[PDB]
Amino acid sequence: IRRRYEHFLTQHVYGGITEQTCDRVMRQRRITRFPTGNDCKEVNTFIQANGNHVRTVCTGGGTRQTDNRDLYMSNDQFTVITCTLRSGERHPNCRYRGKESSRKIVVACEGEWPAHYERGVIV
Ligand SMILES: [Cl-]
Ligand SMILES: [Cl-]
C-alpha cells in the first residue's frame, strides 16, 4: 500500500524528465521488466510533475471511469514522457527513445494513493 505508492512514484513520477533523459533515470531508478531481476522495461511513462501533485488525481482531481471503479482520469492535462526501449536487454545497457505528449492521465487509486499508471489519453 505505502510500498505500492512508492513503487508508483519510482516508476511513473519524475518532474525533471525530458525526451533525451530516459536512459539515466531508467537506470538509476532500476526500472525493470519484472518485479525481480535485471531486465530492461520495454515501455515506461513518466509524468512530468511532483508526487503530491499526481496524488491529487485520487483525492478530487480526477473522474472515476467507470468502467473500472478503481481508475481515475485526471481533470487537468499533464505532460508525460514515454520511454520506449531502443536497445539493451539488461541494466546498465537499457537505451530508450523518449516522446513527450500532453494528456489526461489515468491512474488506479487505492483509496487516496496512486498505485498504477493505466494510460494517458488525449481529448
Ligand atoms: Cl507505462
Ligand atoms: Cl544487455
Numbering used by the authors: 5 to 127
The paper states:
RNase ZF-3e is 17–20-fold more active than RNase ZF-1a or hAng toward tRNA. In RNase ZF-3e, the B1 subsite is unobstructed and the position expected for the 2-keto group of a bound pyrimidine is occupied by a chloride ion from the crystallisation medium. The C-terminal segment follows a path similar to that of RNase A, i.e. strand B7 maintains an extended antiparallel link to strand B6. This is further stabilised by a hydrogen bond between Gly124 and the side chain of Arg107. Arg123, the counterpart of hAng Gln117, is too large a residue to occupy the pyrimidine-binding pocket and its side chain is instead oriented toward the solvent. Arg107 (the counterpart of Arg101 in RNase 4/Arg106 in RNase ZF-1a ) makes two hydrogen-bonding interactions that orient its guanidino group away from the B1 subsite, reducing the likelihood of a role in substrate binding. The unobstructed B1 subsite of RNase ZF-3e identifies it not with hAng but with most of the other mammalian and all of the known amphibian ribonucleases. As expected, its ribonucleolytic activity is significantly greater than that of RNase ZF-1a or hAng. Since mutations that elevate ribonucleolytic activity are known to be detrimental to the angiogenic activity of mammalian angiogenins, this most likely accounts for the lack of angiogenic activity in its close relative, RNase ZF-3b.2 Its enzymatic prowess is still, however, several orders of magnitude lower than that of some relatives, e.g. RNase A. Contributions to this are likely to come from the lack of interactions stabilising the productive tautomer of His120 and the more rudimentary nature of its substrate-binding subsites. At the B1 subsite of RNase ZF-1a, the position of Lys85 and the correspondence of Arg106 to Arg101 of RNase 4 suggest that this enzyme will bind uridine more avidly than cytosine, whereas in RNase ZF-3e, the positions of Thr86 and Arg107 suggest an ambivalence as for hAng.
